[PDB]
Enzyme design. Structure first.
Site, PDB file in Angstrom:
ATOM      1  N   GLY A  79     -16.518 -83.202  -9.425  1.00 32.96           N
ATOM      2  CA  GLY A  79     -16.768 -82.435 -10.817  1.00 32.96           C
ATOM      3  C   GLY A  79     -15.870 -83.152 -11.878  1.00 32.96           C
ATOM      4  N   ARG A 122     -12.049 -87.312 -14.649  1.00 36.31           N
ATOM      5  CA  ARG A 122     -13.067 -86.898 -13.212  1.00 36.31           C
ATOM      6  C   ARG A 122     -12.139 -86.735 -12.216  1.00 36.31           C
ATOM      7  NH1 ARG A 122     -15.730 -91.430 -11.798  1.00 36.31           N
ATOM      8  NH2 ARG A 122     -14.775 -92.679 -13.262  1.00 36.31           N
ATOM      9  N   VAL A 123     -12.377 -85.957 -11.260  1.00 41.89           N
ATOM     10  CA  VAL A 123     -11.591 -85.366 -10.399  1.00 41.89           C
ATOM     11  C   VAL A 123     -12.270 -85.911  -8.830  1.00 41.89           C
ATOM     12  CG1 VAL A 123     -11.018 -83.632  -8.594  1.00 41.89           C
ATOM     13  CG2 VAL A 123     -10.068 -83.537 -11.018  1.00 41.89           C
ATOM     14  N   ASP A 177      -3.496 -73.248 -19.595  1.00 45.09           N
ATOM     15  CA  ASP A 177      -5.057 -73.010 -18.620  1.00 45.09           C
ATOM     16  C   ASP A 177      -4.878 -72.705 -17.232  1.00 45.09           C
ATOM     17  OD1 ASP A 177      -7.576 -73.709 -17.824  1.00 45.09           O
ATOM     18  OD2 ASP A 177      -7.470 -75.800 -17.450  1.00 45.09           O
TER      19      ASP A 177
HETATM   20  N1  ANP Z   1      -6.138 -79.743  -6.220  1.00 45.42           N
HETATM   21  C1  ANP Z   1      -7.486 -79.463  -6.113  1.00 45.42           C
HETATM   22  N2  ANP Z   1      -8.119 -79.321  -4.883  1.00 45.42           N
HETATM   23  C2  ANP Z   1      -9.672 -79.124  -4.995  1.00 45.42           C
HETATM   24  N3  ANP Z   1     -10.478 -78.992  -6.064  1.00 45.42           N
HETATM   25  C3  ANP Z   1      -9.753 -79.376  -7.404  1.00 45.42           C
HETATM   26  C4  ANP Z   1      -8.320 -79.442  -7.293  1.00 45.42           C
HETATM   27  N4  ANP Z   1      -7.963 -79.893  -8.662  1.00 45.42           N
HETATM   28  C5  ANP Z   1      -9.159 -79.595  -9.392  1.00 45.42           C
HETATM   29  N5  ANP Z   1     -10.493 -79.400  -8.347  1.00 45.42           N
HETATM   30  C6  ANP Z   1     -11.354 -79.315  -8.856  1.00 45.42           C
HETATM   31  O1  ANP Z   1     -11.971 -80.328  -9.676  1.00 45.42           O
HETATM   32  C7  ANP Z   1     -13.220 -79.869 -10.407  1.00 45.42           C
HETATM   33  C8  ANP Z   1     -12.721 -80.476 -11.911  1.00 45.42           C
HETATM   34  O2  ANP Z   1     -11.636 -79.842 -12.439  1.00 45.42           O
HETATM   35  P1  ANP Z   1     -11.589 -79.523 -14.100  1.00 45.42           P
HETATM   36  O3  ANP Z   1     -11.415 -80.860 -14.497  1.00 45.42           O
HETATM   37  O4  ANP Z   1     -10.209 -78.551 -14.146  1.00 45.42           O
HETATM   38  O5  ANP Z   1     -12.697 -78.567 -14.319  1.00 45.42           O
HETATM   39  P2  ANP Z   1     -12.444 -77.040 -14.560  1.00 45.42           P
HETATM   40  O6  ANP Z   1     -11.415 -76.564 -13.852  1.00 45.42           O
HETATM   41  O7  ANP Z   1     -13.848 -76.223 -13.707  1.00 45.42           O
HETATM   42  N6  ANP Z   1     -12.389 -76.573 -16.081  1.00 45.42           N
HETATM   43  P3  ANP Z   1     -11.873 -78.087 -16.864  1.00 45.42           P
HETATM   44  O8  ANP Z   1     -10.693 -78.240 -16.731  1.00 45.42           O
HETATM   45  O9  ANP Z   1     -12.050 -77.447 -18.454  1.00 45.42           O
HETATM   46  O10 ANP Z   1     -12.848 -79.217 -16.914  1.00 45.42           O
HETATM   47  C9  ANP Z   1     -13.213 -78.621 -10.242  1.00 45.42           C
HETATM   48  O11 ANP Z   1     -14.341 -78.202  -9.536  1.00 45.42           O
HETATM   49  C10 ANP Z   1     -12.143 -78.048  -9.520  1.00 45.42           C
HETATM   50  O12 ANP Z   1     -12.276 -76.843  -8.760  1.00 45.42           O
END
Ligand code: ANP
Ligand code: QOM
Ligand code: ANP
Ligand code: MG
Lengths: 308, 278
Positions: free
Chosen positions: B21, B27-28, B134
């Site tokens: 995502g 980017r994660v 957040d």
């Molecule tokens: N520790 C974690 N374990 C699993 N998934 C995670 C974790 N941290 C983040 N994610 C996932 O990584 C994705 C990107 O997160 P994020 O950048 O915060 O987007 P978001 O939470 O949907 N809204 P936004 O923060 O404005 O971008 C999302 O699908 C989250 O669920």
């Protein structure tokens, strides 16, 4: 409707030109120039066919299965055709974005026209009102759709002297699926819509009234200019919206404009939408009757202020 | 510049995997520390304009945290302008997608216990003086009983991510308290908004509502409409009356969503309120 014979002419000339292409793909188009940013819309050259079109680009990353539903709802838009509605050529999906290719209106939007002119005269604004009123009636009576986003940036003009509406709300699924909407500095939404209650085409009537005041005076009229500022002629978004809901609506200055024009906008900007004029009442207002019978060479005014 | 060799967790290697995502905070990527981790990749245009100094401060603050209801902050390496934030990877479903699944069966007991876990985690963060900007149902994870909070304090960073008109989602507005919505204006960055301990307990109320209604309070409107409704407080007044749930349940929802921020309870107080319940 009240279709003229010549309107059939120009309708049909568009509908002859419709079939002049069958399919669409990214590489059919060559970027001619940039129009504006919002999605972003470009002047483009179509190569399979000599038509010059406007291609607006909306960037979205969403799954294919929902997309076929949005597109099939969107195909209905090929059905609406009016001298007051920009012609539509087709919709497709390509490289992470739906492209909508439509009729290019060589004068741009009323916002950019206003920028060039400084102020829009009363007599031009009469012809614009008739076109908007008849466009909204058409959408109500034939397709049961309200516009939902009427504003100067979405009113386009050309050198032939036609006036056409764009960017209206055809797809219920597309509204709901767009998670991420964009707010800016000007808002043209009616009070009733901002409070989340039931709304109808009446909210569009407010938007038309407020749009007209901006164009008539040359400035977005919220907040009102001071006494000395109307002679010469840094706010957070929530402060603006709460002004619209709680303070009296903007009105035209009483010196420089006819009573028919002043009364018309006043009837459009009544905050209670049940008392606000409806399309049927607007069609019969004195302001519209005068404008409808007036002889104004609109093409000449447009060409001369915009420098052809 | 801080690297991975300064951390409590013994570091040897870390391999990137598939991304999961993108957002306005980089980017994660699903990673592998012998355990899977979440890696958030950032870029900072702030060429040492106290941004890195602030980043070094906030990241070192995260190092002194550990709690069973909060993600395990592991490491944060910065080879400017490229930064990275490594967190423990939470298996299971987000609370967002969990409450909206038809097959899911939540009751007044399951709902109470879930909220307690969240309050316990949010209480720890406030005790450490860490304001969780957040907080929302998308940033909470559930796995057959285990509840974890995610992506805390992320908004304190001033990295690059855009124009003049404001860029807002609807899922985010439902968690934003009126003090924040009023201050919103173009050209203003997220760092300037008045997040606080009160802003977090407000967002907890929208979570509590989601636990009951399986949806967010405001049917998807134009963002402008959602702004005034929330900033005026009238919107939460309508949705509170529009559907009843229970005097005990509605008590804490009316409490958290209090318009005057000082009328909002602390999280330690919310632990007791959740006790005196069905
Ligand atoms: N520790 C974690 N374990 C699993 N998934 C995670 C974790 N941290 C983040 N994610 C996932 O990584 C994705 C990107 O997160 P994020 O950048 O915060 O987007 P978001 O939470 O949907 N809204 P936004 O923060 O404005 O971008 C999302 O699908 C989250 O669920
Ligand atoms: C939450 C909420 O209120 N959403 C909302 C509210 C009102 C409007 C829109 N909406 C929009 O804003 N645009 C603008 C930004 C370009 C659209 O183009 C747009 C659009 N396309 C389009 C159609 C016809 C012609 I002729 C030109 C066009 F471009 N169709 C098909 C839509 O059904 C909607 C619903 C659109 C979205
Ligand atoms: N069909 C078109 N033909 C010619 N110029 C256009 C057309 N559509 C848009 N433009 C121009 O591009 C600019 C940007 O328009 P647009 O992307 O619609 O922004 P906006 O209307 O203010 N926001 P939105 O109504 O949601 O699209 C307008 O101000 C016009 O000058
Ligand atoms: Mg997140």
């Amino acid at each position: 409707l009240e279709l003229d014979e010549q309107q059939r002419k120009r309708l049909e000339a568009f509908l002859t030109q419709k079939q002049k292409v069958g399919e669409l793909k990214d590489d059919d188009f060559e970027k001619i120039s940039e129009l504006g940013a919002g999605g972003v819309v470009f002047k483009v050259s179509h190569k399979p066919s000599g038509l010059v079109m406007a291609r607006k680009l909306i960037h979205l990353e969403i799954k294919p299965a929902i997309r076929n539903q949005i597109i099939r709802e969107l195909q209905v838009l090929h059905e609406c055709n009016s001298p007051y509605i920009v012609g539509f050529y087709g919709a497709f999906y390509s490289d992470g974005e739906i492209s909508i290719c439509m009729e290019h209106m060589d004068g741009g939007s009323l916002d950019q026209v206003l920028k060039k002119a400084g102020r829009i005269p009363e007599q031009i604004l009469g012809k614009v009102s008739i076109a908007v009123i008849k466009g909204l009636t058409y959408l109500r009576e034939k397709h049961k759709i309200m516009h939902r986003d009427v504003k100067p940036s979405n009113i386009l003009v050309n050198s032939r002297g036609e006036i056409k509406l764009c960017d209206f709300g055809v797809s219920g699924q597309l509204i709901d699926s767009m998670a991420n909407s964009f707010v800016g500095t000007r808002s043209y939404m009616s009070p009733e819509r901002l409070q989340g209650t039931h709304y109808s085409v009446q909210s569009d009537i407010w938007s038309m009234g407020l749009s007209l005041v901006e164009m008539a005076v040359g400035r977005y009229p919220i907040p009102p200019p001071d006494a000395k500022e109307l002679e010469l002629m840094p706010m957070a978004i929530f402060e603006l919206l709460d002004y619209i809901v709680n303070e009296p609506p903007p009105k035209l200055p009483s010196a420089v404009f006819s009573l028919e024009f002043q009364d018309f906008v006043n009837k459009c900007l009544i905050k209670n939408p049940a008392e606000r004029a409806d399309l049927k009442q607007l069609m019969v207002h004195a302001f519209i009757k005068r404008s409808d019978a007036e002889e104004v060479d609109f093409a000449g005014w447009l060409c001369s202020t915009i420098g052809l | 510049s801080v690297y991975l060799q300064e951390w409590d967790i013994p570091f040897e290697q870390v391999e990137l995997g598939e991304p999961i995502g993108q957002g306005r905070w980089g980017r994660v990527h699903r990673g592998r520390w012998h355990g899977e981790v979440a890696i958030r990749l950032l870029e900072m245009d702030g060429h040492n304009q106290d941004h890195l100094k602030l980043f070094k401060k906030e990241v070192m603050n995260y190092r002194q945290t550990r709690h069973e209801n909060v993600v395990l902050f592991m490491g944060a390496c910065m080879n400017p302008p490229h930064l990275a934030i490594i967190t423990s990877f939470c298996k299971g479903r987000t609370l967002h997608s969990f409450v909206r699944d038809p097959k899911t069966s939540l009751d007044i007991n399951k709902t109470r216990q879930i909220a307690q876990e969240i309050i316990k985690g949010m209480g720890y963060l406030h005790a450490k003086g860490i304001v969780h900007k957040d907080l929302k149902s998308k940033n909470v994870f559930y796995d057959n009983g285990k509840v974890v909070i995610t992506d805390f304090g992320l908004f304190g960073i001033s990295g690059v991510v855009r124009e003049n008109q404001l860029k807002l989602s609807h899922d985010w507005l439902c968690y934003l308290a009126p003090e924040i919505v009023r201050e919103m204006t173009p050209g203003k960055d997220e760092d300037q908004l008045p997040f606080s301990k009160a802003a977090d307990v407000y967002a907890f109320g929208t979570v509590w509502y989601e636990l009951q209604a399986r949806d967010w309070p405001l049917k998807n409107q134009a963002a402008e409409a959602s702004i005034w409704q929330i900033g005026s407080g009238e919107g939460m007044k309508r949705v509170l009356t529009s559907v009843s749930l229970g005097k005990e349940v509605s008590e804490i929802l009316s409490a958290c969503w209090a318009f005057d921020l000082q009328e909002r309870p602390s999280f330690s107080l919310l632990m007791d309120m959740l006790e005196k319940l069905p």
